[PDB]
Amino acid sequence: PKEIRDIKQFLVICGRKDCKSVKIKKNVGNTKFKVRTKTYLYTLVVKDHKKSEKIQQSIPPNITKEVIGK
Amino acid sequence: AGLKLQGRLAAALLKCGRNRVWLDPNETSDIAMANSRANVRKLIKDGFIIRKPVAVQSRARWRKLRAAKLKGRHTGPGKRRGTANARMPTKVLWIQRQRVLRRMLMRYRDAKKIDKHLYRELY
Amino acid sequence: RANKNQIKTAVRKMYDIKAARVNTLIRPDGLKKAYVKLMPDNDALDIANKIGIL
Amino acid sequence: TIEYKIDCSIPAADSIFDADLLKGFEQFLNERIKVKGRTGKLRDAVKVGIDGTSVSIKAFIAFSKKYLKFLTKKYLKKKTLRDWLRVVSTNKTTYELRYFN
Amino acid sequence: ARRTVKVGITGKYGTRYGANLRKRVKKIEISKKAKHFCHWCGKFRFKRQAVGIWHCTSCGKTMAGGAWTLNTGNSTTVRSTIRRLREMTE
Amino acid sequence: GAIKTLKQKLKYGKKMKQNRPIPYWVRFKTNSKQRYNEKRRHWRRTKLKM
RNA sequence: UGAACUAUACCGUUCUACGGUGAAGCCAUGGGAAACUGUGGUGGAAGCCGGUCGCUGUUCUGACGUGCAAAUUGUGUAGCCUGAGUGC
RNA sequence: GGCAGGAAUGGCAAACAGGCAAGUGCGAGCAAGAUUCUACUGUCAUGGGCUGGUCGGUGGCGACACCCCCUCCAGGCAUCGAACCAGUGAAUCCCCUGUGGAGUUCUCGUUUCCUCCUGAUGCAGACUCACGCGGGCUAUCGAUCGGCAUGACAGAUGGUGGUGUAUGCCCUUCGCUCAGCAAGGCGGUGUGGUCUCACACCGAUGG
RNA sequence: AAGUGGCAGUCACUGGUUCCAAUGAACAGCCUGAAGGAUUCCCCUUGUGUCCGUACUGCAUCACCGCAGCCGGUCUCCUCGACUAGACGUCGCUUGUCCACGGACGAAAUGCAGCUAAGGGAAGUCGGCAAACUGGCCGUGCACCUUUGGAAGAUACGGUGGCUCCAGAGGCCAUGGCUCGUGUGGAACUGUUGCUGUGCAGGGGAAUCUGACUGUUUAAUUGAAACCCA
Ligand SMILES: [Zn+2]
């Protein structure tokens, strides 16, 4: 897997035809977005508690946004 | 073989071994009607099959004895079986002595405490 | 002596189903067994009720 | 100054650890709580009180909770109630006296 | 302290093989093990790699000569005779 | 062990297939037929050369 | 016909506790006019020693000797165990 | 078919040597296979289709670093004995503090036992003066200054350039941080009907 | 911000050091350079990855060989805790197992095994055969002879527990906090003199013949003074 440097790289990865789904893990420490392109899972870790909400909004509506958190 | 299949499946599902698995003797019938790993899972969830806690190899004796030995209590000449070099090697004693003394000399050399001629002397 | 490719084409010809993958044993007696994993769109149960496996 | 609780409500509702087995337990604690490895040295370090159906250990000093579990198990053993009750951690700074299922 | 009197490097052989043979192998093995003088770099650095091969750890040179010593005696005289023969038939 | 040749595996499979008792209906064949299978191996008793 | 036991050569490859002892080389140092030399360490050699696995097979002329066994066996006793070692 | 190259026949032979690339849940679920199925997360080798102006360029004093096909020759990796010493890392093992569960409690024991975990992979990061593990090389300076020094258990070095210093440069074993990844696992505590089983909650991501 | 709880054996790597009259493969494959030459400008049986082995056993007490379900033999890998020098030996967690034809009767004689034995101490016997003595470690110390290396652990003497102390080595953070010698020496007390308390664990000395040594050997009666060696 690979990490994402920042949210603009996150968004350009989300804006690809080979990307299919974003998993959203809601941790106590942080919140991370796992984009499943082919050959790689791109994780973006963000610690802010409403930057995560704005990023989940930024995510285009064509992507399956699977929220994981237990 | 009455409950051998169930014991094997339970050992697998419990990650211990058939000698830590406890099959309820008052539920032998329902245990014998298990027939599958799914039903053994059900039985384990129901309590008719248990993972027995690992037996004890307590270390309190060794710990007290070790505290006393560090105090110097059971280390006399009547308790030593191996030669002094086999218990504590003279070579590793020399190695750590040389390292200690060279570290000390080199700390003193880095500071303006000794000349380099005095350093080489003592080295 | 069927290859996995032979088995793929033969499966798609007998029952027009796209095989996602084929794995093959030669079972002890000397028969050759084949698992044919269908594409997710296909349904091995909906195909078996045709073939007669029920 | 940490708080710790031992919840005796489950037995006190069934009249087993209800009336003054609780105060006997409190006195057991006042006897046996060890501070720096000594007994009777719990003055200005540990105060045991009772919020009714649950005992409350207030700790000015670095105190342990597994120690309280140990001492409640000792009191249950001395009162023979351990055959019927279990100490269970239901919350940090809290133990509870439950029944066996 | 001094650990032997006559036996030298031949202490490894202990009591075996005979005194007069341990003598010869001592004379040989002292040289086989010693570092010899490099007439190229001027340092006593030739280590015997194999039989007849001597590598200099400072200069890096690699020379062929001598089973147990860098230069045999016949080699040192052959160099001289060949030199003088070339000198005369220049 | 696990390592085999395809030829060896085919032969072992044929031996497994042969290791079978006579059908029940065979004794009743009018002209008195075989009663039991006299060519029947067992892994313990007799080993295959192979 | 046979080198599946077994003998040996080659190709590839494996295995070798724990100690004793203390060779060369080296460091400090005492003596001496010098050549040389005393002492304390370091170092870790050897078809070196004890000894485990292991291999071999001394002795009891033990067991068994219609055996566990057409050669094994002992709650023994022994040989070697860094090598000309060892197996595949 | 022409031209130009092109000594030295074709193979067999190692399931231990050479030789591309996969890990975890050892599970979704097995009665019985599993680095093979499965869910995730990856890696490798290789093919086809499509879209008057040509010695790749640059930075560094240097060790070097960065971004943007063809022939022949010279080398190298593959690649190689054994033993011994020292170092670092791994897992194992143990200790301290704390948690969760369990055993003992006639007396003592803040006690005894288990658990508290982290794989491949990443053109991710910080060091690499290994300021944790060490070799090589570079530049500057030019030593024994008359008592040579540096660094090692032992070696070992040094005007064929020591010590000291620095944008130092390189490679490698690691280790560490992040992603994988906590959702999993481990020790538990419960709810719901129950069923030919899903949910909830808690408990070191310690030194 | 981004080694580090500890240290033991194993493994890996690293830096070396020793040994050799021994120097410890090849090929495929891959890469770099040197010199030349030449230079039009995302999608596809989820592309291809086809073929064969894939159960279980496997130092087996029943899966192989030995006529067998034979105390024999048979290749490699991993390998915990305590005592200890320990991969010895003894016991224990994990794992696995209670299977070897059994039962009664204190169980004759004889036997095969384990032990003891007064007084004597080889008088037994071809012969000290067999068993016994000794046994680890620490300190002191050690003769003849010698190829100067050894002999040698010569021979020998003393000690060894438990507890309470006294000394004694290092490291990190910053001369205080913390970690900190199971590794040593001394002393006091103590005990029905006894402590390597168990398993384990040299008896020693003095000569003659002989082979120098180490190594080899008749699988299944001879291990030797035989063979080999330098
Ligand atoms: Zn030279």
Reduce the secondary structure of chain A to three states and give it as a string. CEECCCHHHHHHHHCCCCCCEEEEEECCCCEEEEEECCCCEEEEEECCCCHHHHHHHHCCCCCEEEECCC
Rounded to whole angstroms, how far apart are CA atoms D74 and D83? 12
D42 in helix, strand or coil? coil
Q: Which position has the token pair 């007998």?
A: C14
In degrees, to the nearest 5, what angle opens at C-alpha B56 toward C-alphas B54 and B57?
125
F2 touches chain C (CB under 8 A): no
Rounded to whole angstroms, how far apart are CA atoms F23 and D60? 89
For strand H, give the nucleotides within 7 A of a protein CB: 15, 27, 29-32, 36-38, 40-43, 85-87, 94-107, 109-114, 120-122, 124, 146-154, 156-160, 178-184, 186-190, 197, 200-203
Helix (H) or strand (E) holding B94: helix B90-110
* Structure-token pair, residue C51: 């073939």
Nucleotide nearest the Cα atom of E10 (by C1'): G23
Other Cβ atoms less than 10 A from the Cβ of C12: the count is 13
CB-neighbour burial class of residue C25 (10 A; exposed 0-12, middle 13-18, buried 19+): exposed
Q: Which residues in chain C touch residue F10, judged by CB atoms under 8 angstroms apart? A: 30
Amino acid present at D76: L
Q: Is the CB of B102 under 7 A from strand I?
A: no
Rounded to whole angstroms, how far apart are CA atoms E82 and E80? 6
HSE-CB for B47 with a 13 A CA cutoff: 3
Other Cβ atoms less than 10 A from the Cβ of B102: the count is 13
* Structure-token pair, residue B55: 């037996």
- Give the chain F residue whose CA is nearest to the CA of C28: F13
Rounded to whole angstroms, how far apart are CA atoms E48 and E54? 4
- Give the resolution to one decimal, in Å: 3.2
Q: Name every residue whose Cβ is closer than 8 Å to that of residue A42 and which is 6 or more positions away in sequence.
A: A1, A2, A3, A4, A10, A13, A34, A35
Rounded to whole angstroms, how far apart are CA atoms D36 and D62? 10
CA distance, residue C52 to nearest chain F CA (Å): 27
C29 touches chain F (CB under 8 A): yes
Rounded to whole angstroms, how far apart are CA atoms B32 and B23? 10
Q: Which residues in chain F touch residue C30, judged by CB atoms under 8 angstroms apart? A: 9-10, 13-14, 17
> What method was applied to determine this entry?
cryo-EM
Q: Which residues in chain F touch residue C24, judged by CB atoms under 8 angstroms apart? A: none
Whether E70 contacts E76, CB under 8 Å:
no
C30 touches chain F (CB under 8 A): yes
User: Pairing state of beta strands D94-99 and A64-67?
Assistant: unpaired
E1 in helix, strand or coil? coil
